[PDB]
Amino acid sequence: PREPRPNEECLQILGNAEKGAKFLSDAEIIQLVNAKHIPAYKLETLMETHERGVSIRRQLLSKKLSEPSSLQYLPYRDYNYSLVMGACCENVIGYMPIPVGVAGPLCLDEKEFQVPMATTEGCLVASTNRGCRAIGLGGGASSRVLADGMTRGPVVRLPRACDSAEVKAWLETSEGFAVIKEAFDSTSRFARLQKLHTSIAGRNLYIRFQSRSGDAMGMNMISKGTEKALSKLHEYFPEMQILAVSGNYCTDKKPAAINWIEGRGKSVVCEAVIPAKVVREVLKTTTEAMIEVNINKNLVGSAMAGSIGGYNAHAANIVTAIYIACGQDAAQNVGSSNCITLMEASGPTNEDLYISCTMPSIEIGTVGGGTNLLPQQACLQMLGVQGACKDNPGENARQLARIVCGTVMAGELSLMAALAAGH
Amino acid sequence: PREPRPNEECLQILGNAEKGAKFLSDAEIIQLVNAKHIPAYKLETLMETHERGVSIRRQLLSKKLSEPSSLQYLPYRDYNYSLVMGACCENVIGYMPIPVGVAGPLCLDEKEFQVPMATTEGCLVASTNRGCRAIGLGGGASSRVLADGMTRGPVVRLPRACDSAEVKAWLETSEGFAVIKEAFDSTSRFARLQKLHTSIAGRNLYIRFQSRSGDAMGMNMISKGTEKALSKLHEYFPEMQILAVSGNYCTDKKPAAINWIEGRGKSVVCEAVIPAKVVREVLKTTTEAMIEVNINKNLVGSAMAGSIGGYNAHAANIVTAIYIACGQDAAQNVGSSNCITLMEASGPTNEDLYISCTMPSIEIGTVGGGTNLLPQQACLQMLGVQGACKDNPGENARQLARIVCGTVMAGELSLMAALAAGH
Amino acid sequence: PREPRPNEECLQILGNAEKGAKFLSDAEIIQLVNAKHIPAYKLETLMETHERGVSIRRQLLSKKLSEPSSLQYLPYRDYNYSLVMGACCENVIGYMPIPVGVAGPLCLDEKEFQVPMATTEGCLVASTNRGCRAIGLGGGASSRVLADGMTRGPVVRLPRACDSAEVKAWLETSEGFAVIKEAFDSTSRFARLQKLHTSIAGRNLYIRFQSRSGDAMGMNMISKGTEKALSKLHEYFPEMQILAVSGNYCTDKKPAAINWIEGRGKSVVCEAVIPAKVVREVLKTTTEAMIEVNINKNLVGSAMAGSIGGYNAHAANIVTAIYIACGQDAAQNVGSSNCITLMEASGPTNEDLYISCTMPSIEIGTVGGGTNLLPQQACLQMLGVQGACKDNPGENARQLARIVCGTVMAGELSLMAALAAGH
Amino acid sequence: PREPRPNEECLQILGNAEKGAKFLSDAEIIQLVNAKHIPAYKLETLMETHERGVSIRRQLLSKKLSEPSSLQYLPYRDYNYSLVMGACCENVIGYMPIPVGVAGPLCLDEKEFQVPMATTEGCLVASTNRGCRAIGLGGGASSRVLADGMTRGPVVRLPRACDSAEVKAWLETSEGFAVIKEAFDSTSRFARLQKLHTSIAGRNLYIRFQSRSGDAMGMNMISKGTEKALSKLHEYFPEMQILAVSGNYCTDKKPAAINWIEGRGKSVVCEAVIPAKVVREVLKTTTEAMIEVNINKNLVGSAMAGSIGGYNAHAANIVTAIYIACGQDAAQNVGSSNCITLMEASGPTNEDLYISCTMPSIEIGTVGGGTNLLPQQACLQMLGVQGACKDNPGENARQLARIVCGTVMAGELSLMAALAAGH
């Protein structure tokens, strides 16, 4: 054993650049932190290795818990914290393992994918797998990206609603839009402002900037561009007050009709045709039952519940699983799960099942944020969409959006079949 | 090195109960699986240890990838798969580490909590921490659970809309409700049917069963009860057809006005008062600016975007982080993030900031599903709400809902201050 | 001719109770009004006959118009103003004739109705007529009232959200509800409080009182009851502040999900089955086309437009026409037109067209307001629902709601057939 | 007295062009109609005068009523039916008088208006008048038209969702849009296609054509243009099926988020500043109370009710009254009443009340439909906006929209003051 050296003493070893942390014990570091000498947030930098830093943070936290042994089974060792510091999380005390299953092969646009799904919900992966199998036997699915651009919705305020109208009119002209577009586009190589969407409420003006962002999800880049554009706008209207760079008009991570109607991020449609025989043998139902359930649950049931954009069975399940697996911001599922699922009869006999999923607001990226960590990069890699696509910028993000829509469609197929076979 | 024994041979070692898997190589197991002898889904059971089983699955998957080395940095070893098999995930190929940070202390209802947040979004934990600090300096927050019950919304169909009306009327009487309540309650000790909510659309009848479920999230239990109740209902109306046990009328994991208006799971309100001085020094703004931004972003901005239940800054961020940390079903954030944030002036001088968050549909549990895994249990434990509360059933789930609402409120405070200080 | 006597002089004739207005000229009355002696609003009382009073008001108004001859073709003579004064309109300058057509016979619940429709929209009545004919040939329609009660949604405020929670909890107990119900019911013979619906937002508590109101539309009576109930509630919580007797939580004359989900006024469902032959010969289409159009316009189209409660073709047309004809408050069409139209195949061959309309929020009455005028009473009379039904209170209002739903259904049938035959 | 001549006989007088109807009695005409010789719908043409024709129709209808005397007080005489036949109504049996009151002067954009309001709701005109007075004392209101174009939302269907994507992409190019614009614009002098808005759902493509329409409301003209444009589109995609010219994507006469977000018809904003003294003396309240009520009723209350576009007190009342007075299609109030009302403190002391109303979807016209009748033209004339404005097409419709927004704002001011003074 041993015992803790006084503070002033300990604060010196820390300073000796040939004899630093590593000559101090956990108790000595604890003492230094408690005297408010060391800032606990700097532990991963201040300590010898990053792992130790998180160890020290864990010990400190444990001391303050009603059950000191709470963190025992929270894993923290043998994890690369270098990539998380100053990028992804703060006050780190370990990591939360989420089991990763694989659904597939998903036969989409003449290719095959193996889709990783990080979930703690039993049977979700198996159900998605059955849907994938049905689609595969059906001759594969097809998808298209319909629109692409991340949006940011700042709110500005003018002295009078008349002034707000003037600003809106000026933004609607070709010259004003050109000036704003130049200012916005100057901030990055992928910043290419598309048509603006404005909304007035009294003297509040809400401006929705939209743009592609390469392979990144685009929030940071769009925000930077917006800021620059708002400065430029302020030059012409010095009385304008920028109230908030985010005025809930984007709309980011909230249910909003605007995302459903205008789109946000990527808008995708996927479709497939399942032969009648396959619907019988794999899905254990019939086309007629599937259509009946689809109409009376996904359309009418959602309408009676007063849903905007929730005209599907469980798109949120698949979207969340894939998002967590692939390092996406999982909160964005709120907006990204918007989907409408349609089923119809098809074929020369009206016996085959046509299915389509439409998802207008898939917010997704393959660069930046959570996609900078190796484990999430692995899941992106097994799909073939990891990182930036140098040849055709944004192609990887588009492909990932297509895969997400296809997987959602497989999940819908399976769950709807299960509900229709019923009991 | 060595080389693979033939199939028939290999299939025998597998059978010898004194000489089973463990005498076979990875290549031999691969051969057996490829001949369709072994079902790959049974690998974790079929193999010697579970870890090997997932190893075999990983090798098989790697062979089919365009980049065989994709899984290199997806971790799978030294993880307890026994708790995941047949409960939480299928076709497991490893786990996805999500960094866990800690925000707090959160001073809520005269107690202090240390809230784990699993996120890959930089600065989220720090911002929540600043909000927690402001609330703490403000004399702590207060919360109340207003309603509690998980819901399931089956859809049934009658021959005619007149028959649907008859069934609805019968469900509305005391005798019919009593019969249905008895049938529903017989299925479990926590199943206590509360008042029914019906909606007709033509000959479709949508019935929303609601009930408390102890400390479990309640989906499985509510579904079981619903099934039993629907059988009982079928006894009185033999012409009734149960179309789907889930008719999107719950509503589960979709944006729906019904959850916002009636509630789903737990309905919570939290409030605090931040002194003016604290708003100046910690939040770097003023009360007036905070109220202006709150009105013109969370209320008016959300209204212009056509939001139902999205009258907040970023409740989804906090909700998702906590949910992933604590083993909740993360897809449920779709419904659980519904929140309205209100700010007003308060105090003898109208200088202090009153803030409140109202979240009517927090779907949450501390037993079952993802909460059965030790790492997620650790995060539940550091909050003091892990598992069932034997004395007062459902108390732990209620406490967790209160903490979620309080943390959301801290996050709102911080983000709104950041937006208001602006630039 | 003649010329105007001085004011003081003229003000005396007005006073002589044997020689009053009628001895004064229009110019003399004009002079008196312009000197601010007579209050123009009292003209119909102050003048000899009411008609003259409105004549004087018209002359005064004409003097102030840029085109003095504007009122020439606005009719005002030979109209009974006695019933409008102090009841229905103020500053009356005449009346606006709305042409009234008749659609029918509508074969509903084994009776025949002749439905008056006041419209200036060409072809609306003819289209409704064709729908009525199709329904009649189909063996008539059937309807049911599913729920009945007008609602008022006051908002009150407590010092703290905790206090609001306390009040909500107290309202949810049997004793508190009993006290409130007694207070509410004491105000009128039809005031019978049904279950309360509360919603908290911070320290705001929104309370939705619901009740039947006999044959009246019920707004006045419900408001009176609410006031009394709120006074009683204030007795138990002296800190409560009644912020507004209408907190937009009713919700009255605004689009709101709450009316769609919970109902407001009368909730009705109507249905019919149209034989295939009749669909061919009268509607000039086929059942399959009708169902296709219904799904892809009323369900999917409305979903893509982000509609709450607008899952129909043109229910608002029929509702407005009937409401204007029958003396209903026409603004209420905003809420009353909420409808979902469903069409399916039916019969032994799936060749016949089953149609149903569901309208959960028909706000309607046959006593009070506009129903006190003879012309509107005539339209109510030709339906057989005029005034109060002494035997079975509220029966006439219910019948009128059924007729409204049936007529809406006929209109939907016709318009949908027209759209499907297309070109 | 006399008695009825036989049919064959009577059918001949009808034919004699020197001795036609007018030599036949009401009983003889009745006999002819009942033998199915005369088509009752042709009565106004077939009879001598139009008035007689409606008389005959009334007698026929009376015979079939349970109370033959029902029509006694439904007026039909001395009304110009020539303008209603083949334009405005069918099977006419008279007209429904709606009392017309006048609110004003409304001081708007430096002019004064006298606004006619056709209502049977007591106190509505008086309340609007008080609001007008307050605004007038406040130095008048200001308004701006922000956007202008009526929309039509057809739905077309392609064989596959991929084909729908192809069509959407083609519509998004400059060349495709140019072709469609040419085809659309060829149909009328006011048809000037603006940017298209498309939405896919599976293989359904919803296209929202928008355009100004001169002074007409524009539905007929927009529909004609759409038809022509869809034919042109069919030329390039022969597999396209036009499913419905109206796919509920306009959206016409239904609550829809799309009208709220994108606008429909005219988008208007109006504002005023009420001095504190005027708020005290005329409105009998204070600015602080007004703002409190506005926030907690029009914003928070509407949010809790799950309103899209209903963030106001009673805009529907004013809109309906004006619409009925001025010959507008009253059903359109459903969409046209969408409004958000905002109140703030203003002035050097924050004592004055700033108010603004924003109405993005005012559907309105001053030519065609109900505006072709003299009584409604009178109400349009007293506003100075009757008919087409030859110099500046569409100016009259824009002015009327501004007046509607201003009147709505006055009504909001008054009602909100009444609610705030409370009791």
Residue numbers in the entry:
A (entry chain A), B (entry chain A), C (entry chain A), D (entry chain A): 439 to 861
Q: Can I see the authors' text?
A:
Therefore, the human enzyme (hHMGR) has been identified as a potent natural target for hypercholesterolemia diseases resulting from higher levels of cholesterol. For the atorvastatin-bound form and from the apo structure in this report, the catalytic part of hHMGR forms a homotetramer comprising two homodimers arranged in D2 symmetry. The two neighbouring monomers of the dimer contribute residues to form an active site and hence there are four active sites per tetrameric complex.
Here, we used SPA cryo-EM to solve the structures of the apo and atorvastatin-bound forms of the catalytic domain of the important pharmaceutical target hHMGR at atomic resolution by exploiting graphene oxide as an additional support on the holey carbon grids. Overall, our approach increased the contrast in the images sufficiently to obtain near-atomic resolution reconstructions of apo hHMGR and the atorvastatin-bound complex at 2.1 and 2.3 Å resolution, respectively, from particles adopting a slightly preferred orientation. Notably, in both the apo and atorvastatin-bound cryo-EM structures the entire region can be modelled as the density is clearer.
